[PDB]
Amino acid sequence: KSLEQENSERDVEIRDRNYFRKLSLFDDTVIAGAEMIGTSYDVFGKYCNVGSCMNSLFDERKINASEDNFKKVTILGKTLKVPYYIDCYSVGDLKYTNASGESIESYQSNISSKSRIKGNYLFFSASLKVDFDTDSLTDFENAFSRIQYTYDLYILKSSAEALKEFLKESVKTALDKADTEEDMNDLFNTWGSHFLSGVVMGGCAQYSSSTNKYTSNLTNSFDVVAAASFAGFIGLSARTGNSFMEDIKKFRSASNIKTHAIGGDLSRFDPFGGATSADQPSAEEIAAAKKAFEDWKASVPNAPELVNFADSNPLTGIWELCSDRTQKAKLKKHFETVWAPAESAKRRVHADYIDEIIIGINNTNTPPEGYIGLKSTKDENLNSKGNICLFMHKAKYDPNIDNKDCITELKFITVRDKSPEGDWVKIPQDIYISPNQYLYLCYLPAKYSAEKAIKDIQLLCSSMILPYGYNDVLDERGERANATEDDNVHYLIYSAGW
C-alpha cells in the first residue's frame, strides 16, 4: 500500500507538471517551472506540490505572442529565457525545511505557518495523509515531524503588480464582479485564494515520522532527533554524543517513517537508494548511502521540479491582482474573516477519545462490537476474580457534526449505596465480588473538549510507578484502590494526553 501511494504521488507530480507546462504553451527554451508563477494554489492542499496547483491566471496567448515578453536568463551554463515578470535567482545549495509538533494540533499549526500567510489557520492539511499513516493522525500518543532536505537549484519570484498586464480577462472579471459572500466563496473555491509568487525549483528528499511520545523516551527534542535520524539514514553527518546515537536508535524503533523524493532522475536514482537504519553502520554502508544520495543530487540540475516555497512572499492573495483597492480590501477581508476560518475548521484534526465505559462479568474478556478491552501489556481482567472486565468505546472527532460527549475524570466509590454528586455517573457493576466489600468506578461526562477528554485507560499489573502524564483513579480518601481480589495488584490509570 506504501509503494502504491508512492507510485500514485509520482504519477500526480509528473502528469500535473506536464499538464501546466503544456497549457502554458512555453517553448523548450523557456526555463522549467516558469509556468508555476501566477498559477493559483489550493492553500489547504499538499505542501508545495504541483498536484495542488489549480489555475494558471496568466494569459498564455498574450505572453507567447511576442519574443519581447521574454528576457534572457543563464542557469548552470544554459542560456534560456523567462517571461519578464519573473525574477530568476541561481542558488545551488541544500537547505532544510522542517515542520514538527508534539501533538497533531501543534503540528498542523506549524506546517501551516510555512505559508507565510498571516493568521491561525490549517493550511496544507492534505499533506497529512501523504506524510503520515492515516490512523496515526488520531492516536494521542504520537508526535509528528516532517523533514525536507531541498536542493535549491534556482528560485523564481514575481509580484501581483508585474503579473497584472498578463492577467486572463476571465480572472479580472471574476475579481471585479465578486459582490456577495457567496460570490466571494465561489471565487476562492473556483479560482483559488492565492497564487504562487515565490518558488524553489530543484529536488528534495522528504522524511516524515509519527513517533510514540510515551515509548520513545528521548533525551533530546524529538524534532532535532528526527533531523539527525534523517541525516544518518542517507549517510550524511549526524551527532553521536549528547545522547544522539541512542536517541536516533529509540526514535526509529518508536516511529512509523515514510519517505519521498521529488526532482532529479528518479527512474535511475533515489536519494534513499542506499539508506541504512543500522545503529552503527560500517564505512561501506555509509559510503553506499552517501553514493545513492550524491548520484541523485547530480541528476537534479537536468531534471528540476517544483519542490518548495521561497522564503519571502511565496503565496500572494488573488485579491492583490485587483485594480480597485476597495475591492482588494473587501476580498482580503472575506478571506481572513470568513472563508479561511470556515475552510480551516473543516480540516481540524483531534485525537480519538473515550466516549463510553462499561464494566461487567465477562468470562472470555470479549468486548461488545465496536468496543475495546482494558490492557496492561496484554488483555487483562479489571478483577481476575469473578472475571470483571472493563471495556471502552472510542469516538473520532469530526469537525462537521456535533461531537459526542467526552469523559474528563475518573474516581472510585467504596461504599454500598451512594451516588456521586453533580454530573458524575456511577458504573453499576460492583468490581469487588466479595460480599463485604464494594468498589464502583465513576466517570464525569462533559461537552467535548480536546484538551480535557480522556484518551486512554490502562492497567498497571504486578511496573507500579505512575507514568507521565497519567492519573491515578482514587477512592473517597484520595488513595489507590487495588481492583483485583486475588494474589495480584491492579491499579487503574488514565490520561487526557495533557
* Binding annotation for Ca(2+): 430, 432, 434, 437
List the binding residues: 430, 432, 434, 437
Q: How far is the CB of 371 from Ca ion (least distance, A)?
A: 9
Of 6, 9, 430, 472, the one binding Ca ion by CB under 5 A: 430
Q: Compute the distance between CA of residue 44 and CA of residue 340 in angstroms, rounded to an integer.
A: 9
| CB closest to Ca ion, residue no | 360
Q: Which is nearer to Ca ion, 265 or 430 (CB)?
A: 430
Q: How far is the CB of 423 from Ca ion (least distance, A)?
A: 24
Q: Which is nearer to Ca ion, 51 or 360 (CB)?
A: 360
Q: Does 383 bind Ca ion (CB under 5 A)?
A: no
Q: How far is the CB of 430 from Ca ion (least distance, A)?
A: 4
Mark the segment that binds Ca ion (CB under 5 A) among 30-38, 264-272, 422-430, 479-487.
422-430
Instruction: Tell me how many residues contact Ca ion (CB under 5 A).
Output: 4
Q: Compute the distance between CA of residue 339 and CA of residue 328 in angstroms, rounded to an integer.
A: 15
The whole-angstrom distance between residue 387's C-alpha and the CA centroid of its chain comes to 42
Binding mask 306-345 for Ca ion (x = CB under 5 A): ----------------------------------------
Dihedral, CA atoms, 235, 238, 240, 244, nearest 10 degrees?
Answer: -120
Kindly state the cell numbers that stand for 153.
Answer: 537549484
Q: Which is nearer to Ca ion, 238 or 427 (CB)?
A: 427
Mark the segment that binds Ca ion (CB under 5 A) among 10-18, 280-288, 396-404, 429-437.
429-437
Sheet holding 440-446, edge to edge: 406-413, 440-446, 425-426
Of 24, 110, 148, 362, the one binding Ca ion by CB under 5 A: 362
Q: Which is nearer to Ca ion, 273 or 360 (CB)?
A: 360
Q: Does 432 bind Ca ion (CB under 5 A)?
A: yes
Q: Which is nearer to Ca ion, 230 or 432 (CB)?
A: 432
Mark the segment that binds Ca ion (CB under 5 A) among 19-27, 142-150, 322-330, 423-431.
423-431
Q: How far is the CB of 53 from Ca ion (least distance, A)?
A: 53
Mark the segment that binds Ca ion (CB under 5 A) among 96-104, 309-317, 431-439, 451-459.
431-439
Q: Which is nearer to Ca ion, 294 or 430 (CB)?
A: 430
Mark the segment that binds Ca ion (CB under 5 A) among 135-143, 243-251, 355-363, 402-410.
355-363
3-state secondary structure the chain: CHHHHHHHHHHHHHHHHHHHHHHHCCCCCECCCHHHCCEEECCCCCCCCHHHEEEECECHHHHHCCHHHEEEEEECCEEEEEECCCEEEEEEEEEEEEEEECCHHHHHHHHHHCCCCCCCCCCCCCHHHHHCCCHHHHCCCEEEEEEEEEEEEEEEECCHHHHHHHECHHHHHHHHHCCCHHHHHHHHHHCCCEEECEEEEEEEEEEEEEEECCCCCCCCCHHHHHHHHHHHHCCCCCCCCCCHHHHHHHHHHCEEEEEEEECCCCCCCCCCCCCCCCCCCCHHHHHHHHHHHHHHHHHCCCCCEEEEECCCCCEEEHHHHCCCHHHHHHHHHHHHHHHHHHHHHCCCCCCCEEEEEEEEECCCCCCCCCCEECECCCECCCECHHHEEEEEEEECCCCCCCCCCEEEEEEEECCCCCCCCCCCEECCCCCCCCCCCCCEEEEEEECCCCCCCCCEEEEEECCCCCCCCCEECECCCCCECCCCCCCCCEEEEEECCC
Q: How far is the CB of 439 from Ca ion (least distance, A)?
A: 7
Q: How far is the CB of 152 from Ca ion (least distance, A)?
A: 59
Q: Does 360 bind Ca ion (CB under 5 A)?
A: yes
Task: Name residues contacting Ca ion, limited to 6-65 (CB under 5 A).
Answer: none
Question: Are 477 and 162 in contact, with CB atoms under 8 Å apart?
Answer: no
Q: Which is nearer to Ca ion, 225 or 390 (CB)?
A: 390
Q: Which is nearer to Ca ion, 249 or 385 (CB)?
A: 385
Mark the segment that binds Ca ion (CB under 5 A) among 46-54, 84-92, 100-108, 359-367.
359-367
Q: How far is the CB of 145 from Ca ion (least distance, A)?
A: 40
Nearest CA-CA partner of 194 in 40, 333, 324, 51? 40
Task: Name residues contacting Ca ion, limited to 85-144 (CB under 5 A).
Answer: none
Task: Name residues contacting Ca ion, limited to 470-489 (CB under 5 A).
Answer: none
Neighbours of 106 (CB within 10 A): 12
Cα-flanking dihedrals φ and ψ of residue 383, to 5°? Answer: -120, 115
Mark the segment that binds Ca ion (CB under 5 A) among 87-95, 415-423, 425-433, 447-455.
425-433
Mark the segment that binds Ca ion (CB under 5 A) among 25-33, 309-317, 424-432, 466-474.
424-432
Q: Which is nearer to Ca ion, 137 or 392 (CB)?
A: 392
Q: Which is nearer to Ca ion, 299 or 362 (CB)?
A: 362
Q: Which is nearer to Ca ion, 141 or 485 (CB)?
A: 485
Q: How far is the CB of 404 from Ca ion (least distance, A)?
A: 20
| Chain residues that interact with Ca ion, rule: CB under 5 A | 360, 362, 430, 432
